């Protein structure tokens with residue numbers, strides 16, 4: 001039921017994307033192959049230490065969410081953790097680590113920015129054959145700065161612990177959540193999956 005619950009969040013948060021599947025491929029659901037809980041104690045403690053500190057700075061409230069992350073560097077993330085040193089100015093919200101509440105938004109990043117050239121084997125952003133990996137993560141948002149338009153930050157806004165990108169007419173289709181310190185997320189579940197050709 002733990003893994004079922006993860007599988008339900010993955011399927012149910014899929015959305016139709018404005019790019020027509022260009023980045024992440026064309027699909028309405030996934031084939032979920034495997035869900036593994038990552039047990040990296042050094043990383044868990046880094047995470048909970050920071051979460052305690054953020055909660056102190058936010059009226060005894062971590063504001064933690066479970067959110068998706070797609071990247072080509074999933075296997076480094078599970079061993080070494082998220083690392084803001086690999087983030088550069090860019091994106092809507094600058095040099096942060098980005099997360100989605102819609103699994104299909106994160107899927108757009110699994111093979112690179114805008115999907116890169118897709119899977120290594122077939123160079124196909126809509127590959128139905130190769131197995132993809134997404135993380136489903138605990139993220140400490142603390143006091144989160146709501147923003148609609150591009151604001152390329154190096155760090156959290158003063159007094160804040162994250163940025164939440166809200167949907168807006170000339171802006172985002174879907175929400176996105178941005179942290180500027182690697183220790184504010186833990187890669188809790190590693191999900192191995194395929195996108196499924198539509199019916």
Ligand SMILES: CN(C)CC(=O)Nc1ccc2[nH]c(=O)c3ccccc3c2c1
Pocket residue numbers: 068069070071087088089090091092093094095096097098099100105106107109113175176177
């Ligand atoms: C913005 N620069 C720090 C480049 C960059 O890291 N892009 C990037 C890289 C990986 C990303 N992965 C996500 O799951 C995601 C989810 C919602 C919105 C953005 C992303 C996402 C974005």
Ligand SMILES: [Zn+2]
Pocket residue numbers: 119120121122123124127128129130
């Ligand atoms: Zn492939």
